[PDB]
Amino acid sequence: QINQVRPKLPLLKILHAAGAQGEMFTVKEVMHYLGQYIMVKQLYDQQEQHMVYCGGDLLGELLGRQSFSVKDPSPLYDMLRKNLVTL
Amino acid sequence: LTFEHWWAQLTS
Ligand SMILES: [K+]
Questions:
Q1: Which residue in chain B has the smallest CA separation from A71?
Q2: Angle subtended at Cα A25 by Cα A51 and Cα A3, rounded to the nearest 5 degrees
Q3: How far B9 CA lies from chain A's nearest CA (Å)?
Q4: List the disulfide bonds (chain A).
Q5: Beta strands, E only, A1-87
Q6: How many Å apart are CA A22 and CA A10, to the nearest integer?
Q7: Which one of A17, A25, A54, A79 has the minimum C-beta count within 10 Å?
Q8: Homologous superfamily assigned to A1-87
Q9: Which residue of B4, B7, B10, B12 to mutate against A (max A Cβ within 10 Å)?
């Protein structure tokens, strides 16, 4: 369906870790589970919570970065573009 | 000030 995407394997593993089921999702669902993954694994900086530290995490491998800021999402969106198969 | 506050604004 046009509003769905198919996450590549490593990103799917991350979504499943956060409780997702299945293989295809809407972008809102992907963001929901990726946010949950970051929250429950407590990867965000406790003082500056828009900062996410993921060195050594599969998420860091996907981002090609040790950290990123939710305020400047471009690196996160670049990661999604490379890891979401669309129609 | 919270991760969720910032994260939630990435989607409409
Ligand atoms: K932390």
A1: B6
A2: 105
A3: 9
A4: none
A5: 4-7, 25-26, 51-53, 67-69, 84-85
A6: 14
A7: A17
A8: SWIB/MDM2 domain (1.10.245.10)
A9: B7
Q: What is the resolution of this structure in A?
A: 1.7
User: How far, in Å, CA of A55 to CA of A58, rounded?
Assistant: 8
Measured in angstroms, how far is the CA atom of residue B4 from the centroid of ligand 1?
Answer: 14
What's the token pair of residue A3?
A: 């509003």
Q: CB B5 to CB A49 under 8 A?
A: yes
- Asked how this structure was determined, the answer is X-ray
Q: Which two tokens stand for residue A18?
A: 């956060």
- Residue at A6: amino acid letter: R
Q: How far apart are CA A36 and CA A15, in angstroms?
A: 9
